[PDB]
Amino acid sequence: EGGPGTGKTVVALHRVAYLLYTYRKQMERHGVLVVGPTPAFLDHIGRVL
Amino acid sequence: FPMMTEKGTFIINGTERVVVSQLVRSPGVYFDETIDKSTEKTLHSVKV
Numbered sequence: 001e002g003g004p005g006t007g008k009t010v011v012a013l014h015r016v017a018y019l020l021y022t023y024r025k026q027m028e029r030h031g032v033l034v035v036g037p038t039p040a041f042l043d044h045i046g047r048v049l
Numbered sequence: 050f051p052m053m054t055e056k057g058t059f060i061i062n063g064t065e066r067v068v069v070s071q072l073v074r075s076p077g078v079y080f081d082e083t084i085d086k087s088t089e090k091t092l093h094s095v096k097v
Contacts, residue, residue, distance in 0.1 A: 029089065
């Protein structure tokens with residue numbers, strides 16, 4: 001939870017990428033669920049993974 | 050009690066017979082992972 005103008009979205013996407021890469025071997029079968037008004041997070045996941 | 054001869058065999062009712070060794074799973078504890086038929090997930094199991 002960052003305030004406005006802090007760009008917490010970029011940090012969140014980087015954190016998601018790092019976590020999904022580190023634990024990829026134990027998450028390629030359980031899958032990942034993205035919840036939100038827009039799929040932008042899913043867009044980044046597809047872009048990098 | 051039937052007795053074994055010097056050749057490693059037995060005699061029963063006049064016929065010569067042999068008892069062959071058997072390969073069996075040992076009484077250990079065994080862990081394994083399998084693929085679920087429905088969801089295709091990985092399922093881990095253990096049996097004693």
